[PDB]
Every structure is written in structure tokens, then in C-alpha cells.
Amino acid sequence: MLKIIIPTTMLLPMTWMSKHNMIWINATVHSLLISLISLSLLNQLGENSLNFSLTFFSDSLSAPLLVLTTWLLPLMLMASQSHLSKETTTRKKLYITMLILLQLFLIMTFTATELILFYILFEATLVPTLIIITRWGNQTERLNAGLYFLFYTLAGSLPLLVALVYIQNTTGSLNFLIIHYWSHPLSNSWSNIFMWLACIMAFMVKMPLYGLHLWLPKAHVEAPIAGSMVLAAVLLKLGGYGMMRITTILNPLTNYMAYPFLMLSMWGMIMTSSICLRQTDLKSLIAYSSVSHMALVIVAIMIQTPWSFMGATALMIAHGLTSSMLFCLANTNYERVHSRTMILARGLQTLLPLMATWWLMASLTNLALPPSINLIGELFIITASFSWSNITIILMGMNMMITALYSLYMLITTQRGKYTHHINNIKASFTRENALMALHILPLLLLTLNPKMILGPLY
Amino acid sequence: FSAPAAYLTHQQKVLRLYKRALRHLESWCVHRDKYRYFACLMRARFDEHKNEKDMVKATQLLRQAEEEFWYGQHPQPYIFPESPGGTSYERYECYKVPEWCLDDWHPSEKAMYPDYFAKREQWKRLRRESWEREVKQLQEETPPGGPRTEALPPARKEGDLPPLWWHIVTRPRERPM
Amino acid sequence: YTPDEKLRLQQLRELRRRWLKDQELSPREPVLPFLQDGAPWKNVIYKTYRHSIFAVTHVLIPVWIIHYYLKYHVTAKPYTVVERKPRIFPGDTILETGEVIPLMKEFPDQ
């Protein structure tokens, strides 16, 4: 696995020792090369995981996420080139290094074989994120947003540390393979209930469960574009990956302990989609849409059926791509009008035609249009939940309807109508932004030809 | 359009009702001969009490007509195509590109319309020079406590253009295509 | 109209008409200066040639490709092209032959 870790580390001295006219170019070149190399990790075996060594391993769950991170880093660089153009060279290098450290930490989380190493790195991801959100954010709310995010994550994760150490002491090991083979049923005692909670709430905070989701809108709104990109694409899927990894040792107590979280997510999807129906900030609308989409992944993980896990993996990948692209489009609009108000700039379908097509395709993917992987994941989760209980279909259908409603409402409000008269600074879209949207969309559409790659280890 | 007023007089409101009544009558009486017959009868009613001088009674005359009009109002009155509520309302709004978008063209694009862009720059020069006069002129004619109506002054002297003219003059046409 | 309103409207009308007349193309608009429109398309046949090359490139190549895919796929994998069994009436078959006519009643009327 070091074939990906070592170049990621070498990115730092490269950027630090590169000329001020070549940081972005070199970073993009070698991040894209790293993604190309990490594409080799998709050759997963049917039954056994790829055990590179004692410390790192990868299965059909880790590989798609690793590829997504290695692919998203260049996209973040391209999106963050614009506003970080008048910054000094040292701060640009610092921002690039923060992004690289975040990517490295994400890789080592998705490849870790030890639960405690996974925890260490998955909590280490906070520091680069928090710095990015509180240092290069534009608003004055970036300070409160960073605190909310950091403290929600830590208050969720510290009991997870306690529980992991307790499990290490009792079972003797935290290795995923051993903890999977030497698995044992959990009794219905209060101690097991609280161990289950300690293991679950940490990831429930990460992928925002309805009620613990208040940090996501602040974090996604106040952070810069690249920060929002990671937070939406990978930092939310961290919780899902952790939950899918740890649910092995949390049975059969889950059957009875999942009801509160299942109900919370199945109602919060509707609540957050309705909130999206009545949002005035584009980034806030996208963040609440992300909450609504991750509610389905939470449900799928808490049901623990093979179709649910496949749908969860597919939805994670698809939602990461779609949310990142939506945030990039909103960033372009913001950099054009210097405001995040949705109703401020209207009739953009007549001034930026290709950007309108990008918005249309992104919204279609967001509302789970067949045969996109978004729909593949959503339909798999819906079938799994229907098998779990037939009543679930009502909430699932209502959520789908409201998602289509608010996505098309965003499309109509932004890229339709009469152009805003007074706004005169809307210049023709650059090649960089269009290339960013194309690099967001094309892998997403291509994955529908080979959906088996992102369907998880249970395919 | 034209600048509105703070209120509509009893004369204005009666005329407004009259046009609505005839247009709704046209919608009801589809046949042209049929409409013309009842148009004079409608005209007679608006002339039965035209000379009424009691404004209290005159207002009461208006009130009864509006209640009669609303109850007899056509549920689906005829609307002109290029009118609010019409089938062709705002149909070409997606083609009305504002003029400032031309400044963002590539030089190669501008090289294909040299005569137009050259004449366009002359229009820009006119706006740039005349703007100081318009700023000056507005301040003079404006009452001290700002304006109280949306009506704008014309060009009082020679070598001057009506203040705030650019958008009204360089507005997109109805069929930009 | 008040006199100021009428005068302003007249001046705006003059400026608007001047602008509209300005919005008129000259006798030419320079188009940038076509190997495929040279020797291949000097005055190539705008009839049979076009209506045959379109037919080729739109039906003949696709039908060849699809039929070849229906050599790559149909007999290389079972239960891929399943045809409904042809209806069998009191008539002769092909490979095995044979027939059984049914016993018939008789009603010439209607």
C-alpha cells in the first residue's frame, strides 16, 4: 500500500521546494498520477481482502473510497486555485500541504488494519480540516463553524476510543481480520448497550444523523470550496465506512438498538429535504441535501443486509461526487456574484450556457436519475428497507419526491428565469471551471457502465 | 412604461373598471355582433349616472358596479398573447441578453463585427461624457428631501440627454432571437 | 402627458431609434477563412450521392455492427436470444415432418 502513501508524503517537499509559479501545476500533475496509480487498487478479490502487510489492507469497500480521495485532491486544487491567487507563496504552499496531509490521513484511515490506528488517523483528519475551515474561510462565522464541527466530532469519538481500548483489553486484538473471525454475540446487558452506543455514536456524528447534523451546514457554508469538497465527499463517508467496519462486533444487539437511529434517519431525510425546499442559501441547501442523502446510508448500515451494504457503498461514492460538483458550481456562482444568496443572481441559463448544462446534469444525478449510480444505491437501499418493513416505502417515496422537487427548484431558481439586471461582473466561464465540472461528471457517468466496482465487498 | 401616481382618482378608477367590463364582455360575447350590441348598453349604464355629483354617491355607484363586475366576471377572460397571464408571456425573455455581455467577447469574436463594435464604442463614449451632466442635472431639479415621484426630468438644455437614459435606450428588443 | 414627460419621451424615442438603427449589420460581417469542402465537395452530387452515403453511414454500418455482435453474443452465451416457439397448426413440420388433422364437424350454414 506504500505505493500510494509514499508519493503522497513526497508531495509535501515537492510543493515546498517548487517555484512560486509551479506549485499548482506540479501538485495537479502528481496528484493525478497518484490517483492513476491508486486505480490499481480496484482489482479486488471475490472473497479475501488485499492484505498488503500487517498494517494496511484494502477490500472492495476501501478501494473505491481511496480512489475517490486520490481523484478528489486534484479537483480541490483546481477549485481552490481561483480565490487563493492573491495570497502569498508561503500560505499557498501551506494550504496545499494541508490538503495533502488530509489526503494522506484519509488514505491511511481507509487502509488501516487496526481499529485504533483507524481511530487515530480518522481523528487526525480533524486538524487539517479545522485549520482549512477557520483560516481560509471568508465569513466571520468560520470560527464558530470550526468549533461546532470539532466539538461534535470529538464528543462523538472519545467514547469510541474508550470502547476500542476496552475491546482491545477484553478480546486481545483490534485487527479487523481477527475481530471479524473471532467475532462473538453481544448480550442484552446495559454494559453491552453502552459499548454499542460508544462504538456507534462516533460514526453517527461523522455522517450526520438527524439531530447531530447541526455542524454540517455551518461547516459546509463557512469553509472554503476545497474544504467543503472534502467535508462532503470523504469526511462524511468516513463515518459510514467506520460503521460498516465496526458493525461486525455489534451483533446481535443492533437488531434491537438500531430502532432509534433508524427512525431518526428515516424522518430526518424527509425533514432535511423539506428544509432544502425552503432554503435561501445555496451552500446550506446543498449541505441539507447531503444530510438527507446520508440518512439513507445510515438506514442501510443499520439494517445490515447485503443489498443494504451494496446500496450504501454506491450511494456513498455517488453522493460524494454529486455533492462535490454541486459545491463547485455554487463556488463558481459565489466567485462571480460574491454572495451565496440563491435568489440574488437569476437567469444564469442565458449568460453561462455550459454551466447551465453542468447544473442540469448535477441536479439530475442528485435526484437519482436512472441509470446513475445514485439511483443504483438508492434503489438497493429502498429494496433492502422494504424487505425490512413494507411501511418504509412511504417515507422512501416521499423523500425521493422532495429530493427531485428541491433539486429542480434549485435548478430553476439559479439557472433559469430573467437575468439579474444590475449584476454586470458575470464573465464567461473559464476553462478551469468547466474542466473541473467535466472531471466531476465523467467518472460519475462512466461508473454506471461498471457499477460492480463501487458496489462494495458484498457484490 | 410611465411613472405611477400615489393614488388613482375616482375618474381613473371608473375608466379602469370600464375597460375591464368591456374586455370581459368581449370574452363572454364571443360573437362580434353580439358584443357590439351589449357594449352600447354597457356604455349607457356608464352614462346613466356620469353627471352624478355626490362623490359619496359616486363612490357608492362604483362599489355596486365592482361587486356586479366580480360576480359577472368571466372565469377565463381573454388575454392578449404578449400580456401578463397570456400564453406568450415572457416567452422570449430567455433571449434578451444585456448589452454589457458584448464587452466580454473574445477579440476574434469582435473581429467578425467591426462596424457594429466601432459604433458601439461611440455609444459608450456618449454615456461616459453625458453621465456627469445627468448626475449634476438630477441634483438641481430634485427637491431637497429627495424625490417624491418616479418621473424623471428631460434634457433641459442642448448637448444634454435625459438623465438615466442608458438602460431605457439600450434595452433589448421584444424579439431578440 | 405633462410637457416634461412628453419632451423626455420624445428624446428617449430619438435615442432609442438611433440605437436600433445602430443594431444593424453592415453589408458584410467578416467570417474567418475547408479541405473536405475542396476537392471532395467542390460541387459533389447533392442528390443520389448524399441520399446514399447517409443511408450507408446510418443503417448499413449499424446493421453490420449489430449483426456481428449477434455473432459475438447470441451463440456464445445461452438463453440470450430466446424466440417464442412458432405456432404449430395441423400442418407439416420441417426437421421431423408429420401432421395430425383434427376430426371435423360440418356446418355449411354461416
Partner: peptide, 12 residues
């Protein structure tokens, strides 16, 4: 009379 058509920049 051929009238100039006001369009956004399509070159980019």
C-alpha cells in the same frame, strides 16, 4: 435587414 444578435461570449 440583418440585425446584430446580442449573444454571450461563446468562444470560451
Amino acid at each position: 435587414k440583418r440585425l446584430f444578435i446580442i449573444k454571450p461570449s461563446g468562444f470560451y
